[PDB]
Amino acid sequence: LDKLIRVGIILVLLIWGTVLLLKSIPHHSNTPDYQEPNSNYTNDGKLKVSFSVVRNNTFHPKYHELH
Amino acid sequence: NEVVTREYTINIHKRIHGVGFKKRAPRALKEIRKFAMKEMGTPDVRIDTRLNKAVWAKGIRNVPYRIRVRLSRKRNEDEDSPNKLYTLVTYVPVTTFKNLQTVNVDE
Amino acid sequence: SSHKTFRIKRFLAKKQKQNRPIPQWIRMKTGNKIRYNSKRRHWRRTKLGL
Amino acid sequence: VRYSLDPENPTKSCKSRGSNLRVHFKNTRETAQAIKGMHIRKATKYLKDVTLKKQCVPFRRYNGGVGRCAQAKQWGWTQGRWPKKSAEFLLHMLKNAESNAELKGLDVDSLVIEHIQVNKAPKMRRRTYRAHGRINPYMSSPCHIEMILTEKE
Amino acid sequence: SMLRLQKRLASSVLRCGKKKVWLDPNETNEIANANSRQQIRKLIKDGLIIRKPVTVHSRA
Amino acid sequence: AVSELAGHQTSAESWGTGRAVARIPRVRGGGTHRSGQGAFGNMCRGGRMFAP
RNA sequence: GCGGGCCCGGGUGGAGCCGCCGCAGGUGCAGAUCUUGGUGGUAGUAGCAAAUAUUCAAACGAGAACUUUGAAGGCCGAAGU
Ligand SMILES: [Mg+2]
Ligand SMILES: [Mg+2]
Ligand SMILES: [Mg+2]
Ligand SMILES: [Mg+2]
């Protein structure tokens, strides 16, 4: 019976708290994977900065020859 | 003891001497802060907005040579900061600065 | 371009729908080797050269 | 985890470490060398003075191009700077170590830094754009820092 | 804390440039919860937000 | 035996002299890692084994 | 053991391995401006300097030179920023 009374108390406390404190709350939207997707996107950005750099012809303004 | 108020006339002319045109009024406010810190032993100095307007009245290149300000030390009533007291500097409109001394405004 | 044709609009719509990230519950599957979408497309780089 | 130079008396010693901290390795190493062997209160006071540019950190190994200052005369050295980010990063480490000692049941005002070590962390990669269509790496140099405090007084 | 939306909406409601939009610096909290218009118009009616007069360009 | 096409499926040309590279056929163009890298040689990665 | 190398001791490691008689080879690297990958000195260095300019107070905030609000000083000056 003690467990049941504890459950009742918890439920009433939660209801009171929400009514007098918490703000707007989303119903359910398949709670974002962002908690680990932060590190996943950190690795993804490490991949993104690893994009291939195209080769280029090095400029060199040389002088004249010889005669 | 530490709640006294008094008036000072700061010579901005000899403190902003040799500074650039675009860094003269900000230097004037920096010198006002330094003057308040040196006179009143409070690292926290708050400048009144009207004092800023008085400093900036004639643009950034031309700052008034003399300006008379009130130096008031307060209690910092509610902030739980390491600085126990702070100083408030208020602009005093004055016609002429001749024979004006650092008169202490008794409370 | 605000003057697009129907085919181009359908292509853009399909790309936009494909740009979304991978759902989290995929990671909990038994035989899963995928950690991120790895095919995300941003509009600054990889300019979708139509 | 594994600590290099394990404490001689684990009963009266606390530990603290951090992984992949985005702070320059050379400045942090110099600050750790300067702070090594100090008392905990002295170490905190020295770090706070460094943040206020009242005391400098002597640069002895990585001193190429470092300017000179009068603050370095206290250490018998010429080079010196005032690394702020490194000082804050290892001051948070000092706070964590003090909390660990307090939880473990140790005298906070008797702790000294017996061991402190800074190791290089894997580099983050960014890119910079140069002349004639060239791209060169623009990479961060994070570090791993671990230290052991021992009650010695 | 963040009142760019309110100023942008008040400029459209008053049909001014938002250079003349004056948000009350004291009661910013009451401005903050006015995300939608027709509620900013209520603040205009209350006088919390006013359109400032144009800068004087004398001709004399 | 190894496949006859192993290593020669690429179209690689050797960059001429006047460049810091070492006169080895390299992958032509592209924005890939396998671009200007090296092919057709037994000393190159991927490449082709000597005397298949 | 002249040598090519090899046999034991200790630690880590967790699942296959070696000697001998013969057979076979994609069988031994210091270089080839060799190929691929990684890491140093340079070096906490070059640099973060094209187009006049910012300052004060408050708010949110753990944290404010860079956010927002108000005030002041400026610029773009109807072929306009
Ligand atoms: Mg582009
Ligand atoms: Mg280019
Ligand atoms: Mg430099
Ligand atoms: Mg002009």
Task: Decide: B52 and B69 in contact? Cβ < 8 Å.
Answer: no
Chain C residue numbers with beta carbons less than 8 Å from the beta carbon of A30 are 23-24
- Closest Cβ opposite residue A50 in set D125, D132, D134: D125
Residues of C numbered 4-43 whose beta carbons fall under 8 angstroms of chain A's beta carbons: which are they? 21-24, 27, 35-36, 38, 40
**Closest approach of A61 to chain D, Cα-based (Å):** 13
Q: Tokens 């359908």 appear where?
A: C10
Strand ordering across the sheet containing D111-120: D13-21, D143-151, D111-120
Residue at C32: amino acid letter: N
What is the spatial distance, in angstroms and rounded to an integer, between the CA atom of D90 and the C1' atom of G81?
46
The whole-angstrom separation of Cα F41 and Cα F25 is 8
| Closest listed ligand to the CA of A56 | 2
E39-55: b (≥16 Cβ within 10 Å) or e: ebeebbeeebbebeeee
- Closest C-alpha to D87, from D42, D56, D50: D50
Q: Scan for tokens 């000082």, then name that residue.
A: D87
Q: How many degrees, rounded to 5, is the angle at CA B40 between CA B36 and CA B41?
A: 115
User: If you measure CA to CA, which chain C residue comes closest to A29?
Assistant: C23
Q: Rounded to whole angstroms, how far apart are CA atoms E9 and D145?
A: 51
* DSSP string over chain F: ---TTTTTSS-EEE--SSSSS-S-EEE-S-SSSSSSS--SSTTSSS---S--
CA separation for the pair F42, F24 (Å, rounded):
11
- Strand pairing report for B66-73 and B5-11: antiparallel
Chains that touch C (3 or more CB pairs under 8 A): A
Query: Which amino acid, residue B40?
Result: M
Q: For residues C20 and C41, give the distance between their C-alpha atoms in angstroms, rounded to a whole number.
A: 9
Q: For residue D133, how far is its CA from the centre of ligand 2 (angstroms)?
A: 4
Covered bases, chain G (protein CB within 7 Å): 26, 32-37, 39-46, 52-60, 67-74
Per the listing, tokens 């974002």 go with A32
DSSP string, chain A: -HHHHHHHHHHHHHHHHHHHT-------S---GGGTHHHHHHHHHHHHHT------PPP--------
Data resolution in angstroms = 2.8
Task: Establish if F32 touches chain A: CB-CB under 8 angstroms.
Answer: yes
- Residue among A49, A54, A56 whose CB faces D125 most closely: A49
To the nearest 10°, the Cα dihedral for A33, A35, A41, A46? -160
Asked if the C-beta of D126 comes within 8 angstroms of chain A's C-beta atoms, the answer is yes
Which helix (H) or strand (E) is D137 found in, with range? strand D134-139
Contacts of C33-40 with CB under 8 Å at 24 or more apart are C35/A40, C35/A43, C36/A37, C36/A40, C36/A41, C36/A43, C36/A44, C38/A44, C38/A47, C40/A44
Count CA atoms closer than 13 A to C24's CA, side-chain side.
10
Q: From the CB of residue E29, how many other CB atoms can be counted at a distance below 10 Å? A: 9
In the numeric block, which tokens belong to residue F21?
């590279």
Q: How was this structure determined?
A: cryo-EM
CB atoms within 10 A of CB D34: 24
φ/ψ (deg, to 5) at D104:
-70, -20
Phi, psi of B25 (to 5 degrees): -65, -45
CB B27, CB B19: distance < 8 Å: yes
Q: How far apart, in whole angstroms, are the C-alpha atoms of residue D85 and residue D62? A: 17
**Interface contact F31-A54, CB threshold 8 A:** yes
- With beta carbons under 8 A apart, name residues in chain A contacting F21: none
Please judge whether A30 and C36 are an interchain contact, meaning their C-beta atoms are less than 8 angstroms apart.
no
Sole residue written with tokens 């408030």: B88
Q: Does the beta carbon of D2 lie under 8 angstroms from any beta carbon of chain A?
A: no
Identify which ligand lies nearest to the alpha carbon of D81. 3
Residues D24, D87: Cα–Cα separation, whole Å: 11
Closest A-chain CA to D126: A49
Beta strands in D4-72 (DSSP E): 13-21
